[PDB]
Amino acid sequence: EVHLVESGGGLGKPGGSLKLSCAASGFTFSDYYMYWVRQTPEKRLEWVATISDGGRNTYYSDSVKGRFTISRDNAKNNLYVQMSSLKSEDTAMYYCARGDSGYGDFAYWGQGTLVTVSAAKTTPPSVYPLAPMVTLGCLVKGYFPEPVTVTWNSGSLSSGVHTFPAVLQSDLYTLSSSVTVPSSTWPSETVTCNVAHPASSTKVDKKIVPR
């Protein structure tokens, strides 16, 4: 199975630099052209750059030409993009994509890595348990930048979960996440929300106990 995995995302200072990486596997990496495509917070998809199979040829969007550098390491199966002179328009989810052997379609995409360009301070979340079929929750308040990941019981409770999009207010995000379980399972069984905020190197586990 073909796989593409981006890494390197996070907070970039305006005017600063940030390097993204994309690990490819499942195909002869050196036999394909590779692309970077981004999605802005308004959900617009915009092609960023192309690099030829051998790494000798490159193409850039007008927005990023002179600032970004696309490169590849055909021995390590890695695609890169070096960003410089970061602007607010660079704030986006960045995907690495592969085409096929040739209509110009993006046949394989990565999971994406989020880049936020801002002078606002990285702040860790404060995770609060929300105790009252029963509904429980977790409030992930006052963090920056996005993203955070929330799971319930390490992923085991995935059904009946609603993790809501974060809302920004005065340079800090807040999100909530609910989990609905049959009354026979809580409080007789333990329910824990697991929060990860990679930009602040924080992981928090909060068991929901009755009041």
Partner: protein
């Protein structure tokens, strides 16, 4: 560059109904590609080279077009089709994308399941007090939420968030958070989250009392 304009912005259909979305290009292109995207994931290849379905794409999807106008049709829409569809060309450099068309799948009206939570003892320990309300799995998306403290509506310091349409049951959900200081929170006793939805002529409420 070639501008791709997609219409309509939003399609809304009941399961079994047919919908057609179009992608218009500022110049003639030889082919059109389409992607389907759901919240929390990358765009998935859906149609390549105008009419070829991607692997796993059901036969109810079809693509057609030529020149400056292309289309994507779903002959019988299903709950799983609730997604945003994007068109993309690579006939002129650079490759460009359309702004997407979102598909909303209609279902039988469903009442929000409302839940209210007082501030955690942990947050109170730091001087803050957020009261959270979840209004879960309802249809249609249109809903109003009010906060009441001791029998009167409270406005200011309320942050709301909505989820995208659920792919399994075609419902929406909303979170509402009222943030007060611990001092202000502790000056009152009754807290109510009040929803107004078309599935009930009366408001749907959930309350808690600080005496409890």
């Amino acid at each position: 560059q070639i501008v791709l304009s997609q219409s309509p912005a939003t399609l809304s259909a009941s399961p079994g109904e047919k919908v057609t979305m179009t992608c218009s290009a500022s110049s003639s292109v030889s082919l059109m590609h389409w992607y389907q995207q759901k919240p929390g994931s990358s765009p998935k290849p859906w149609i390549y080279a105008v009419s070829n379905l991607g692997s796993g794409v059901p036969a109810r999807f079809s693509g057609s077009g030529s020149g400056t106008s292309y289309s994507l049709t779903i002959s019988s829409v299903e709950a799983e089709d609730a997604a945003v569809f994007y068109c993309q060309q690579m006939s002129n450099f650079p490759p460009t994308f359309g702004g997407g068309t979102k598909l909303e799948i209609k279902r039988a009206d469903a009442a929000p399941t409302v839940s209210i939570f007082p501030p955690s003892s942990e947050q109170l320990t730091s001087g803050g007090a957020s009261v959270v309300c979840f209004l879960n799995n309802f249809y249609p998306k249109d809903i109003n939420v009010k906060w009441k403290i001791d029998g009167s509506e409270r406005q200011n310091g309320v942050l709301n968030s909505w989820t995208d349409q659920d792919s399994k049951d075609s419902t929406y959900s909303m979170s509402s958070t009222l943030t007060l200081t611990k001092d202000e929170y502790e000056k009152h006793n009754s807290y109510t989250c009040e929803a107004t939805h078309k599935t009930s002529t009366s408001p749907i409420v959930k309350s808690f009392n600080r005496n409890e």
